[PDB]
Amino acid sequence: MKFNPFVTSDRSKNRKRHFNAPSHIRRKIMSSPLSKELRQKYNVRSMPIRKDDEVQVVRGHYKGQQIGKVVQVYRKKYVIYIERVQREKANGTTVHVGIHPSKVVITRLKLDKDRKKILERKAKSRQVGKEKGK
């Protein structure tokens, strides 16, 4: 149950803060879970997805053992595009059909200098949760 008297619980106002989100808050709500292998090597649960992570789709019309990298992150439509899952148009032109990153499992991260520190910050705070158990 929510106890804080300074955070909402109403349907109209969490939706309004969802679709009118700032574009740096919006990379946080477009987070995706790490794979079972890769959450054990880093002891972290989930990550915000960036442009060049290898990924497979875990639910939808297009799913099942399809590692392949994302190629475009529409934050405006809350949608990542992945380089293999595609769709022919009526024209014969082929386009990327887009999916939501919660329906998606990262299988290989792209590390830079900053995505080391985002991992280590989310990892070091998880021993502190285990250190509460006295």
Binding site: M1, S9, D10, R11, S12
Partner: protein
Amino acid sequence: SELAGHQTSAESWGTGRAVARIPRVRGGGTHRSGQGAFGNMCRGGRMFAPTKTWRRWHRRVNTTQKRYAICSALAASALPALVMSKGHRIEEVPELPLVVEDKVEGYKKTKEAVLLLKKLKAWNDIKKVYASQRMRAGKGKMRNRRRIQRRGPCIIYNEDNGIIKAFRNIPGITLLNVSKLNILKLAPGGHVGRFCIWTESAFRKLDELYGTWRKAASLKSNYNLPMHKMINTDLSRILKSPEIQRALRAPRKKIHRRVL
């Protein structure tokens, strides 16, 4: 209806002109220029008897009836016919004023909470609350209450040592204090007989919190427990008593139907 629906300039057209004598809006140009203005008939009009914020919202109950209602809500939570006919699955449970010892007030983890309800055979009531995880029928869903849920058992205590945290995550449960009870919790819906789990030091404080008929309550300054209109209530025994059926006539068990 905030200020009023009376923020419109409008006169009646008055005279002939073959229109009804409702006020019309002024001016021209715009659509809303000769249309029926304020009054409870018009598109954009003012409602009949607009609700006021000084409606008498709140009701008083005198305190001897509040205490009367809470004594009748506890006496029905011990009769097994009334607590089961409100729907609580108390088939497998032992003795109806369930009393666990005062060690249970110091649980600080809900894993200890759930095995308590399993070993008290009351978990099959919580499992009935999981069956009622419905969503609301109607327009109350967009007034931010969506999920309907049964009320289950309630656990009553005194001297909290962590009991309020161990049980509150289990869905459909209620925790109220034995010093400050609530008729809105002990009888949801207005119907009597909610299933309750007592704790010893809560179950013993009731003797000094409402009194017996010999001595008044000590923690309530001028209150005793309400007397009875009926001492004996089983009239399958009064009407079969030898004092009564000595004095009765005889039963008249012909019919004497209509004679052609």
